[PDB]
Curated annotation (Swiss-Prot), chain B:
InterPro entries reported in the protein's UniProt record: G-protein_beta_WD-40_rep, WD40/YVTN_repeat-like_dom_sf, WD40_repeat_CS, WD40_repeat_dom_sf, WD40_rpt
Chief location of this protein within or outside the cell: nucleus
Keywords, in A-Z order: Acetylation, Chromatin regulator, Host-virus interaction, Isopeptide bond, Nucleus, Repeat, Transcription, Transcription regulation, Ubl conjugation, WD repeat
SUPFAM superfamilies reported in the protein's UniProt record: WD40 repeat-like (SSF50978)
Effect of D78N: Strongly reduced affinity for histone H3
Entry-linked Pfam families: Beta-prop_WDR5
Organism of provenance: Homo sapiens (Human)
WD repeat extents: 14-53, 56-97, 99-139, 140-179, 183-224, 227-267, 270-304
Important for interaction with histone H3 (site feature) positions: D78, F104, F234, E293
PROSITE patterns attached to this UniProt entry: WD_REPEATS_1, WD_REPEATS_2, WD_REPEATS_REGION
Record-given protein name: WD repeat-containing protein 5
Family: Belongs to the WD repeat WDR5/wds family.
Location within or outside the cell: Nucleus
Length: 96, 305
């Protein structure tokens, strides 16, 4: 299905960290929100922000050998006339 | 029992795009309006006839605020700046730079020597009116700031953000006195002190308005029935007659509640799009409402109650 951004992938990885990147959309993003947690896990999800100017990120502090679910939200911002929110996100799974 | 009878008296057309905010002047003579057409427009509060088009911003404007003497105006725009205007001349006195992102909201303190601003940079800034200098930058939130407002003596600032937080700030020190949290943590789209400065009206994007006491972090009243899940809609205390809660809505209606019994007492129909802003006249039972792109107009309503 349609999503912003597109083609989310893992560029490189360590046993305890991940290097992710995506396609910077033609439309410009005010800021990205990257959420990550254990795949199917009951444990809550950690999240941080990424400027809409950069299309890469590094997720540290992970545990080795466990499946992780990475999700990137692309928020579009503006004045009061436009509602603040995100396009449909994109998610990938990766095992450290 | 006692209900108001607000009635459409005027429709204020002239704005090119969506209207973002409407505010009455303290002297009750004028009505300011900000829009996405990068313009500000001044109207008569009593007959609604156009007066002045005031411009300067390079992008749209989300909020506008009056000074205490009804002689100045401040505007929050998407050009990352605020601008102080002389209403009489309609000219840019000072331009406030420093927010680095969309400036969403703004307000004068009752002394009108300070200006508070909230932006998409997740910060609250306190500006100096005469010099245009940024006196303080409060790292208030971790999400876009939706509303900022002083109290009656201007000793306190209240702020709201999409992080779902409501923070009261000491104007003098810039320190945070209290944080109002909800365990569900929905985005807070609007906050405002009550006229007596003892209460705080907060809007969350779960179709809910709540009256807060802020001395004690306890919810007193809760108002529902309206639709609010996407837009940052203004809300007001109506005190000039009966005690009501006035707010715009996403079903193109102006909702009016009974402040005490929390019941809906009137729903003003007429707008074509989402009513984004509402304003109450300081001395008269008059309501000013504006709407978005499919309704580029402002409406004046008067009641006997």
């Amino acid at each position: 299905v349609s999503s912003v951004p597109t083609k989310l992938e893992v560029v490189a990885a360590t046993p305890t960290s991940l290097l992710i990147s995506w396609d910077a959309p033609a439309v410009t993003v005010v800021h990205y929100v990257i959420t990550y947690g254990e795949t199917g896990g009951n444990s809550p999800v950690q999240k941080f922000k990424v400027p809409g100017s950069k299309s890469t990120a590094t997720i540290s502090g992970l545990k080795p050998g466990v499946d992780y679910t990475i999700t990137v939200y692309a928020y579009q911002g503006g004045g009061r006339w436009h509602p603040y929110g995100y396009y449909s996100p994109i998610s990938i799974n990766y095992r450290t | 029992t006692v209900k108001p009878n607000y009635a459409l008296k005027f429709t204020l057309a002239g704005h090119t795009k969506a209207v973002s905010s409407v505010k009455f002047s303290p002297n009750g003579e004028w009505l300011a309006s900000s829009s996405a057409d990068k313009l500000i427009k001044i109207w008569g509060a009593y007959d609604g006839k156009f007066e002045k088009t005031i411009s300067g911003h390079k992008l749209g404007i989300s909020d506008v605020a009056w000074s205490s003497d009804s002689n100045l105006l401040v505007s929050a725009s998407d050009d990352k700046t605020l601008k102080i205007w002389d209403v009489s001349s309609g000219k840019c006195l000072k331009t406030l730079k420093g927010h680095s992102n969309y400036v969403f909201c703004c307000n004068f303190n009752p002394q009108s020597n300070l200006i508070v601003s909230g932006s998409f940079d997740e910060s609250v800034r306190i500006w100096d009116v005469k010099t245009g200098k940024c006196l303080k930058t409060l790292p208030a939130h971790s999400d876009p700031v939706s509303a900022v407002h002083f109290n009656r003596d201007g000793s306190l600032i209240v702020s709201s953000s999409y992080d779902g937080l409501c923070r009261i700030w000491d104007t003098a020190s810039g320190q945070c006195l209290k944080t109002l949290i909800d365990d569900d943590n929905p985005p807070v789209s609007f906050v405002k002190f009550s006229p007596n400065g003892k209460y705080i009206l907060a809007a969350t994007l779960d179709n809910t308005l709540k009256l807060w006491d802020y001395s004690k972090g306890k919810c007193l009243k809760t108002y529902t029935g309206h639709k609010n899940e996407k837009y940052c809609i203004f809300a007001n205390f109506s005190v000039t007659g009966g005690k009501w809660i006035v707010s715009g809505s996403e079903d193109n209606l102006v909702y009016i509640w009974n402040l005490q019994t929390k019941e809906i007492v009137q729903k003003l129909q007429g707008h074509t799009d989402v009513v984004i802003s509402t304003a109450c006249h300081p001395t008269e039972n008059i309501i000013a409402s504006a709407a978005l792109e499919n309704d580029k107009t402002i409406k004046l309503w008067k009641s006997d109650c």
